Amino acid sequence: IVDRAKMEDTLKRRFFYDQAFAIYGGVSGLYDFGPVGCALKNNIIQTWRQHFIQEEQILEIDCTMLTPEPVLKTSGHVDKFADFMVKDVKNGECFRADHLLKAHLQKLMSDKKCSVEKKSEMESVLAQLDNYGQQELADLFVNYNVKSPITGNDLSPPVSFNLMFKTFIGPGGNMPGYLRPETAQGIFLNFKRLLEFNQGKLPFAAAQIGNSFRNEISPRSGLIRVREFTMAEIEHFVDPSEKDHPKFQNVADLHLYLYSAKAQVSGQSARKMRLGDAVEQGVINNTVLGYFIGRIYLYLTKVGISPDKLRFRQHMENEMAHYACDCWDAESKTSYGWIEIVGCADRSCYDLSCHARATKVPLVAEKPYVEEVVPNVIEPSFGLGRIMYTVFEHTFHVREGDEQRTFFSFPAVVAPFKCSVLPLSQNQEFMPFVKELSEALTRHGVSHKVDDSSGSIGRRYARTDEIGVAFGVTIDFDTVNKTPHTATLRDRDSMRQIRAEISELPSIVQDLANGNITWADVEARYPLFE
Amino acid sequence: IVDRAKMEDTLKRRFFYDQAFAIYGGVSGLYDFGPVGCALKNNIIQTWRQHFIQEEQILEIDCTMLTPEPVLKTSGHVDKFADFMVKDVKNGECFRADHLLKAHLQKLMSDKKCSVEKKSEMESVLAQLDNYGQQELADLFVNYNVKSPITGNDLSPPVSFNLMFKTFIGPGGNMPGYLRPETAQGIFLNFKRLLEFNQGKLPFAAAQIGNSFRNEISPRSGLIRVREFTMAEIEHFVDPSEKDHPKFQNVADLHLYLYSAKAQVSGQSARKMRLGDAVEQGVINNTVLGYFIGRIYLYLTKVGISPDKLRFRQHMENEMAHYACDCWDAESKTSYGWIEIVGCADRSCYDLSCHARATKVPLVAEKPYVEEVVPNVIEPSFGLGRIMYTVFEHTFHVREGDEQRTFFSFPAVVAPFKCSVLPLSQNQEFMPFVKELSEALTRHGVSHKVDDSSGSIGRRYARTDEIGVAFGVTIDFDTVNKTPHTATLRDRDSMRQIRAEISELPSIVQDLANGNITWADVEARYPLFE
């Protein structure tokens, strides 16, 4: 339970992000990222690069965003990539059918005038919604009588609205195209010279961190639903017969909530298994999937998402992507209910096949006489957008002081900047102290900023906390005067302080942020301070 | 003089970049960046961030790419933003008039059958080409009889083809839009909450590093002309009466080639002045411009561009951008002649004005009773695309050995990775040595990679040089056997080596890359090696 109202308000005021083209009414599904937003957004794509590209020697490429017609036709995107949209036959108002029906039903199950017998039934209708194809969705839009949310008119019948943006490359209109709804296609259309890098042998994973455009219908989900976003995608090309990851054992003992395809059809709660077991019982196909699912958990977790508000639901036979046979999503429980933030497909040969065929250009590899194969691709797609957002809600708190102060408990690895050095006076009695501390902190690789903002120390740290700055060091007169020179070390969340030799503080703040020491350990080592 | 042929071939083979959607014939003006390309492309945007955002406490934001109709109409982009295109009345073949006429004339001046009197005249026609508006360009396209380059047919009359891509945001067609041809607009539409950050006082500069789409007509300039690219843009909001930069004196003593607007009309060569003087004589308006022009020089230079193949040409009264009153470009002499790689506008109030008006939302500041003003914006726009390319040609060399080996002399600050550790055998006699060296190099912050590729040491370093890896350390038997343990330190360009205690090498390779020591200094300190 979080305060979407109060939070959005804080986030936009400190300018983590806000509405794009504000002074024009703004466009739905489009937002701009302000300074702290950028800082935090770049800390996540950075933490990610380590956790994946670095930790897996993943090849990286940077493809185009403008894709020409054929490429997306071959991938079958021009076809199956779209959402069901309806529109009241009055004014041209559109709505994503998929969701409107869900909104209606919740309204019905919520009205006390409902028989527990129908309520239980409707749930069952929502717990399958993504499987509902053109027809079933058509009928349902009749039985339940779905009508325009506003001025309840009569919605047209569910239709298919392709989510890809449309444009024409170059003068004229001979070469039409779209804005890549995913980065993957580029990583595929480059398979040949990519295999080469890994010596033609599998497995090997390529990757991309760039934008994708998805002309959504009704962006009303805040940052969650946007028509333009940055996504990190890994394309793990493995040999079909070797769908077995060598590192699995590292993420084997993780105990994470899983919501199998069965548990969804056998209408039962998601279990909190162990990856190792989850694979034994054949819940999670192979180990390649398992490893990634494990890492994906370690990442989302490390960035800031709460272990208890995260899970992995599997897709349904027809909820499936138009390019996968099996797939698990990383869902984060938020004010918008559970929401997919990271996807883990298992698109089997379907990609390189389509392209190899359509162009008559062979896309394969070899193995030890030396047989040829079409690498199956397990693809972990990250919605850096929705991820940073989950981190927002999962770590947004309210200082328990009438005043109504709000702080973010961002892990030291994603905080706008780890420490905030703040002295009382600006005079020269302090500079020689602030200077050193800064340079010393710099030497220790600790992102920091010297505070200036007017106000009592406690009012200062108010803003520092506002944007989740991990720590803070107070430099007062006693720091300058008394000898030895000690400053105040203040933990963000607790607001508890520690007096300590301003010389050691750096190496300490470092150990704290790097997870090498606990706040408690500090209170045990150093004298407190009020 | 460079070998575009041989170079492009090398660049694409090592996969710095290549043609987008290759297995489909590919699209013109679109390319994909492979691994080394990315590594180098990220070293430049990184080196840039320091040189500017860091060194100038520049605020950073990340706006949308999809812009809605009004925004670009207000900026006057829907109007004046386009290139003159012609097309033979036979097949629908297009060409950018602006250039075709230039191609023709060069052909005429090149044919020996021309009177030195006409040749001199035609030049004068090219040395004004960007000023030629609809009419003048129309007449000229007649007099000289410009006809289709291929199958010389009859080109239509010069027309205006808007360079912005076109799409519709959301279902329907009520909300049309384009893909931002520049990042700036976003930095402007966010001025209010941006001024706020700097305490409402000027000057203060915002910035953005993202993509912009320019639906060019005839992309045939390789990477130079592309329909999609990453550009770093700084929006320096200064008070009209205070167009005087406090740091100028730092870049005052720089002596750089300038090609004033006059020198272009007074048909004379560009002078190699000094920024300080250049401002005295009122050649370069104010100092704000001067400082940036200075930095822009230091950057491009530091990244790899040759001091002698770089200059700053000013715009002409009607070559001017549709938003500037004064402007200087950073031109780099290349195989495609001089080409603008970095732009330095002086768009006076024109931006915030248009938007303030059109929306009726006031955009101003105050100064010490406390008067209000509309900040003038000096904007340094960087074409990270064309910049990295200039770096390619300006540092592409051919090993003087029949064999035909090609190396890149990339500054240690942009090289794919500074050092390349390479031992002879893979056995355990070496690992304990390779391991340490790597970790030690890591500790020193020196990007490196342990070589494996099969081949004689000299064949190995061949590939290392291919992609401009600054240095190389050879670990042989004597390194393992003999005591002390010394390895071979090899400079890329010279190929000259140095035998030295494998323990010190790290701190050394560091000092070398960080520009703290010279190769010569090393040869003087340590024993040579052949």
Ligand SMILES: NCC(=O)NS(=O)(=O)OC[C@@H]1O[C@@H](n2cnc3c(N)ncnc32)[C@H](O)[C@H]1O
């Ligand atoms: N290349 C395979 C692929 O397309 N996978 S997927 O994108 O369909 O699935 C993964 C989801 O993509 C991201 N995503 C989707 N639509 C949005 C949105 N409108 N706003 C923000 N983030 C979004 C989600 O963050 C991530 O969970």
Ligand SMILES: NCC(=O)NS(=O)(=O)OC[C@@H]1O[C@@H](n2cnc3c(N)ncnc32)[C@H](O)[C@H]1O
């Ligand atoms: N925001 C102000 C603005 O629009 N400035 S400007 O872009 O018109 O001028 C600066 C130039 O923009 C970049 N640029 C232009 N067109 C291309 C291209 N087709 N390929 C690659 N790079 C290009 C050039 O690298 C850079 O010199």
